[PDB]
Amino acid sequence: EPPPEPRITLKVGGQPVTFLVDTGAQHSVLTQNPGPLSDKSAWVQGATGGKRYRWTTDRKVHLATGKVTHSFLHVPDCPYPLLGRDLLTKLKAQIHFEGSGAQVVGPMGQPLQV
Amino acid sequence: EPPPEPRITLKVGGQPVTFLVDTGAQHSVLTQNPGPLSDKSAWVQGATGGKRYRWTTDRKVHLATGKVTHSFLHVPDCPYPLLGRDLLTKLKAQIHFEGSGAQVVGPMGQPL
Secondary structure (H helix, E strand, C coil): XCCCCCEEEEEECCEEEEEEECCCCCCCEECCCCCCEEEEEEEEECCCCEEEEEEECCEEEEECCEEEEECCEECCCCCCCEECHHHHHHHCCEEECCCCCCEEECCCCCEECX | CCCCCCEEEEEECCEEEEEEECCCCCCCEECCCCCCEEEEEEEEECCCCEEEEEEECCEEEECCCCEEEECCEECCCCCCCEECHHHHHHHCCEEEEECCEEEEECCCCCEC
């Protein structure tokens, strides 16, 4: 394997996906088995370079704050699926590094896991 | 032009650096005029590919409680300095997403 902490498992289009929680990512990313892809693409700038990638079609995403529709960047070069600021803002998540490792906590104060 | 939120400004080597706080970064990153570099390098795997980057020599970094000595990756291909999980652990930081903003606080709600 899973990504390191902080990580979260979410149902995305009916399948569980374990994400690295990534405050440095502007948009969320799927890396393998993305399902149907749109013919729309975007320029993705990473830490080490940049490349063009496709968006997925819409997926239902089961957030603790309630389900929403979301489309992901399919980036098969990326080592882990990433949950970026686009969905973190919807979750109003809190990420805690005090204690061992790191835990994701919802807006209700309930710990999310994964 | 600062990095997007969540962001924090820390003194490194005696001067402030505004970091993008990045829970997706395994180690912390400087991007420009980083000072003395180690002879050592790391393989850095980013979202789009990987290659090697040099470690800096040790730096004095001013955290909330205490100074620490820390070394950074120098990644000039990266658009912003990144405060990764290495220093987030040392700061015992919390990141809060609220409205459309994001804020970084200390182990007990003290802002940074």
